[PDB]
Structure 1
Amino acid sequence: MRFVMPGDRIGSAEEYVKGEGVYEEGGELFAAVAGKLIIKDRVAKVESISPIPEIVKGDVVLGRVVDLRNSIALIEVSSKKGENRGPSNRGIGILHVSNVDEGYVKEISEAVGYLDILKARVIGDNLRLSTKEEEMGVLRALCSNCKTEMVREGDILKCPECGRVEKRKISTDYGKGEW
Structure 2
Amino acid sequence: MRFVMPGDRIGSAEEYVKGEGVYEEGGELFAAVAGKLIIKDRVAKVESISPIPEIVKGDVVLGRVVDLRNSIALIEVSSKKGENRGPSNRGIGILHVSNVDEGYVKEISEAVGYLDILKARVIGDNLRLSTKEEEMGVLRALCSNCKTEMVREGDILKCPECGRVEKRKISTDYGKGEW
Deviations 1:142-173 (A, max 9, x none): 00110000000011000001100000000000
Structure 2: distance between partners of 1:39 and 1:153: 53
Deviations 1:123-159 (A, max 9, x none): 0000010000000000000001100000000110000
Shift of 1:102: 1.2
Structure 2: distance between partners of 1:61 and 1:75: 10
SS of the residue corresponding to residue 99 of structure 2 reads helix
Shift of 1:62: 0.1
Deviations 1:62-117 (A, max 9, x none): 00000011100000000000000000101101000011111111100010000000
Q: Tell me, yes or no, if structure 1 residue 100 matches structure 2 residue 111.
A: no
Structure 1: distance between partners of 2:38 and 2:30: 13
Shift of 1:40: 0.3
Stretches of structure 1 that go unaligned for 5 or more consecutive residues are none
SS of the residue corresponding to residue 30 of structure 2 reads strand
Aligned length: 179
SS of the residue corresponding to residue 93 of structure 1 reads strand
What's the TM-score once normalised by structure 1's chain length? 0.99
Structure 1: distance between partners of 2:145 and 2:48: 47
Structure 1: distance between partners of 2:104 and 2:26: 56
Stretches of structure 2 that go unaligned for 5 or more consecutive residues are none
What's the TM-score once normalised by structure 2's chain length? 0.99
**Matched-pair identity in %:** 100
